[PDB]
Structures are given as structure tokens and as C-alpha cells.
């Protein structure tokens, strides 16, 4: 619509690129955190100095010259900040939205870094990494299907039941693997997705999708075995189960 739409989009894409670059910088910071943590663990365990770790974390946020290369400008962020301020004053709506978003993100580097570091998941086994990847794929597929369930609430029944059966079969093994996988699923909020599967509006009698609910419930029973934390988290949603059945 704008007479200079080409230039509008040019700087929109430029900000797109810069946000991607900030994401890569955040990834590098997270990797640095994990590397220093591993170094501390190995040196201590072939106590740990929390003060030195905190000093390194404080330094890497641009406070010292040791993190200058991370900074994306030669003016110490002044050029980037001025660019964002100028863009926020531009007529185009999405350009101003992006400029404001980057401006807010640039003054919240530390909180975002700690949030992401908490979101980081550590696995010592490569087979555990593959298990995490397959669980993530299954959870994403089930979440997408639940989000758009009006189609099946033929081709969307077999896949759902197979995913549920695979998750249930892989959910429980021994006792240590059970706890490990319970914690893993807890981090990815799988319980929320599988609870969203129970709120779908369904007819009184189907005889086919019922088996799905015959499995979705089962997993929740295995998600609480010997895990008071899972019981507590699912207790906040206890009003869902207060239905005749």
C-alpha cells in the first residue's frame, strides 16, 4: 500500500535477519553457559565455585570487553538502538511492530538468557537424544491434530491411535527409565497436549474414537506412578475429570 513498499520490505527483511542473528547469539551464550558448567563439574568431579560462574555470566553480557565481539555494533549498541528508534517512527505498521519487538528484546538479554538456559535439557546418552527427538515429533503431530480436530471430530484416526499406542508402550520401562521419561515428558508439557485431546466435542456414541480416550487416559495413569510432582500438576486440572464415567 505504501508508495515505498519495496524499501519498507527491505528494512523489514533486514530486521528479520538481525533478529535471527540475535537468536544465534543467544544460542552461543547458552553453549558458553553449558561449557563452563561442564568444566566446573569435571574439575570438581573428575564443591563448585558459584562465584566464578556468576562472574563469567556477568561478564558475558557485554559488561566487559571479553564479550565485545558478541555485540552486533561498533558503537556499543548505539547504532542499533538509533536504528530501532528511527524504524519505530516509520509509517508502516509491521515495520514498527518489529522495531518495537527488537527494542524490547535488547533490554531483556539477561532474563531471556536465564529463561532459555532453564529450558535447556541435558541428556548424557545419544540414544536418549533420539528418544527426545521422536517424542518431540510425536507430541508436535498430536498437538497439531488436536488444534484442528474438526475434520475427525478417517485418515486422522489411525495415526492418532498409533501415536497414542507408541507413547503408552514407550512410556513405561522398569523404574529408572520410567522416572527419566516422566521428567522428560514433564519438561515438554505433553500432559497439556493430551489433556486438550479430552476436551474435543464428541458425539455420545462413536465406538471408534473411544479407544483413543481409552489410551489417552492410560498414559496419564502412568504419568503419575511414583511421581508426586505429576500428580500435583494434574491436580490443578482436577475439575476436568469430575464427569460421570
Amino acid at each position: 500500500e505504501n508508495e515505498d513498499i519495496v524499501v519498507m520490505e527491505t528494512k523489514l527483511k533486514i530486521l528479520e535477519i538481525l533478529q535471527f542473528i540475535l537468536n544465534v547469539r543467544l544460542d552461543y551464550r547458552i553453549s558458553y553457559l553449558l561449557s563452563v558448567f561442564k568444566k566446573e563439574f569435571v574439575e570438581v568431579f573428575p564443591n563448585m565455585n558459584l562465584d566464578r560462574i556468576g562472574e563469567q555470566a556477568e561478564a558475558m553480557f557485554g559488561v566487559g570487553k571479553t564479550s565485545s565481539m558478541l555485540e552486533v555494533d561498533d558503537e556499543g549498541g548505539r547504532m542499533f538502538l538509533r536504528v530501532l528508534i528511527h524504524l519505530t517512527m516509520h509509517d508502516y505498521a509491521p515495520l514498527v511492530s518489529g522495531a518495537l519487538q527488537l527494542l524490547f528484546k535488547h533490554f531483556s538479554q539477561r532474563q531471556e538468557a536465564m529463561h532459555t538456559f532453564k529450558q535447556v535439557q541435558l541428556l548424557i546418552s545419544a540414544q536418549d537424544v533420539e528418544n527426545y527427538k521422536v517424542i518431540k515429533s510425536e507430541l508436535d503431530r498430536l498437538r497439531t491434530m488436536v488444534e484442528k480436530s474438526e475434520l475427525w471430530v478417517s485418515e486422522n484416526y489411525q495415526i492418532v491411535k498409533g501415536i497414542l499406542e507408541r507413547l503408552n508402550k514407550m512410556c513405561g520401562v522398569g523404574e529408572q527409565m520410567r522416572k527419566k521419561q516422566q521428567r522428560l515428558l514433564k519438561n515438554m508439557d505433553a500432559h497439556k497436549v493430551m489433556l486438550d485431546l479430552l476436551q474435543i466435542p464428541y458425539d455420545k456414541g462413536d465406538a471408534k474414537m473411544m479407544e483413543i480416550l481409552r489410551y489417552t487416559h492410560q498414559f496419564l495413569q502412568k504419568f503419575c506412578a511414583g511421581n508426586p510432582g505429576n500428580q500435583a500438576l494434574l491436580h490443578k486440572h482436577l475439575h476436568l475429570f469430575l464427569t460421570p464415567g
Binding site: 553449558l34 561442564k38 535439557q121
Partner: protein
Amino acid sequence: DRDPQELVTPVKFARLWTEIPTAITIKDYDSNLNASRDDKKNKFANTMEFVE
């Protein structure tokens, strides 16, 4: 925009204990994926240079 090219996630949330190094540098951070980046860039290396 073709089948060989695929989108990438800038931030990775799954990490492996043994793969994590004691210390990390920007050069090493690039180097981990540099093999894939180089073997895929040869097709578009000239366009890469022209764009820069």
C-alpha cells in the same frame, strides 16, 4: 529455495553431555557446522559473494 535447502533453528535446546566442550569459542562455534555449511555453500558461494 529447493529440496536440498531446509530451514534451521537458530537456538538448540537439546544438548549432549559428552559433546559439550569445556570451553567454547566463536571460531569453534562456527566450525562445528562449518563442514555442512561449506559443502552446501559451493552451489551458492558465488551468489553469496555477490550479495555481500
